[PDB]
Design a protein around this nucleic acid. Sequence first.
DNA 1: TATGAACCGTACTGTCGTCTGCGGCCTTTGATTATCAATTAAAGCGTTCTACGGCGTTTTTGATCGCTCAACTGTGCGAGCTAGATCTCA
DNA 2: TATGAGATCTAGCTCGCACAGTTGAGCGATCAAAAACGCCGTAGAACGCTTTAATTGATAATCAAAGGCCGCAGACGACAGTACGGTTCA
Lengths: 68, 67, 68, 67, 67, 67
Amino acid sequence: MELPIAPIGRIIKDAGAERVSDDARITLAKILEEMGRDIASEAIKLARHAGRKTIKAEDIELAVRRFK
Amino acid sequence: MELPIAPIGRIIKDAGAERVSDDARITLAKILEEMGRDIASEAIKLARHAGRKTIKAEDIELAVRRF
Amino acid sequence: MELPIAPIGRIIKDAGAERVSDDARITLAKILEEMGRDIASEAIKLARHAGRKTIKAEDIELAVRRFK
Amino acid sequence: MELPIAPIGRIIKDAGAERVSDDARITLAKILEEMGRDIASEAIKLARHAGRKTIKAEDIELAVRRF
Amino acid sequence: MELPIAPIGRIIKDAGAERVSDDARITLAKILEEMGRDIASEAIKLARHAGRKTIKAEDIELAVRRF
Amino acid sequence: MELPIAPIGRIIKDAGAERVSDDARITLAKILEEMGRDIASEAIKLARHAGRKTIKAEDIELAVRRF
DNA sequence: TATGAACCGTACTGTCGTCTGCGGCCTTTGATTATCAATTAAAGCGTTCTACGGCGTTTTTGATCGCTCAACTGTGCGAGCTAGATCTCA
DNA sequence: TATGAGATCTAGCTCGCACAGTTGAGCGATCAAAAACGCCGTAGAACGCTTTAATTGATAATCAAAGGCCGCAGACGACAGTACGGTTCA
Ligand SMILES: C[As](C)(=O)[O-]
Ligand SMILES: C[As](C)(=O)[O-]
Ligand SMILES: C[As](C)(=O)[O-]
């Protein structure tokens, strides 16, 4: 669990939530981290397909146009 | 930009990336934050529909199954 | 409708079908052609992400590695 | 090899490809043929589950909802 | 949450678990219930495709093939 | 057969089934129980690998990512 | 990874509450026989679009070079994670 | 509407995110020889179309069976409250 809980809680709060449960925060944390991992994997596959070793923003933006 | 860059960089690195550009990190940050905001909004609408004011984990888990 | 109907009908026949409706054949034709177009499009985006303009088998296998 | 190569090449061309390798055409051919076989099999099982022996469009459209 | 927790806990116990967390029991409960709902839906689609209104064991056994 | 039939029947009913055969209920029961046993076993092996003896929800959530 | 150590947080015994399970009768739906049209297979026709090169040529993909740029030490001020009290919904 | 349940708030104690050069490396460039795709006219093997004709999938109606619903005795899942073996800290 690399992602911190507090900023995500602040996200849910900024979304319009009066009160936010810790379970919701941790859940959204694990979910967002999961999506991050998947998108990262796709971007890596893309960059590796592009003959490059460094992950650029292009790889992320292209990998994100395929769910998740 | 509520989400920090370093942990996300650690995510991309743990995914199998030898080197990661800062632009990629910031991009993935904005993307994850966007998804977070949207999902949070949906969960808020669900919980508000459920007669509750506090966002519980069920609201999140149900909201993510609406993408 | 780029794809011919008869070979696809022969595919359904080779699958184990005693009798095959024409509606089923044309339907499967439109479906397979649709899938083909989608996969081709994805492979094109992948190759275009690369330094190439020509679509190679790698692009096809990678686009099919992320589903139609 | 039930499927012809040329129409599929024309499909890739209609997708927006300037130049297309033969390997890509044959690969996409084998892939589309594979999917065709799988969907056909599923549709056959579907119709066989029913009181019919003939494969109708309904069976295909229902079998394709299994990816 | 239609499914009870205790029998599932007994399942995990019969699997070879010395001690079982309640979170694990509830998790496996919701998961198994989810799978049950999905399989039930598929079986319903199957029986409705078969021109019948009653869900028979055939529909379940065929719906569980997805897999 | 650790799992009860009635709640599963209520699941199939909640899925949209007008009428449900008892054979279908028992079948889905045995299926869900089977999946439960397999997933439980996998989770047990997972927890046994992690240096813990107690099965937590994490082990289940990781075991279900094998299907 | 090994030594403990404080503390979650289980297994536990036992009690209460609900839920299943089951046999009752009934109502509806499941196959089943029989009829009858829908339609799909089989063959044979004509015509098209396949597959196959031969060359001309766009396009790769080699190799080598500055060159931005990401990783990686160390630092300070920021940021989250925690513990406890108070209330606000659940 | 009564009560745990639990989320917000306050404060502070760390924790790791942010940052600034430094060093080294992967990246985009520059042409360049060569794989390799496109073009296109040719021979031919297909797809398509169509009528014969029989197998089939509906329709209709009668029969039997098989869930649904109701209600009851008994099973067992849920729920505190308490010693402790286990987990996750250091
Ligand atoms: C205090 As608020 C912005 O989470 O409603
Ligand atoms: C040759 As083209 C214009 O169909 O990509
Ligand atoms: C005693 As056991 C098989 O439930 O761990």
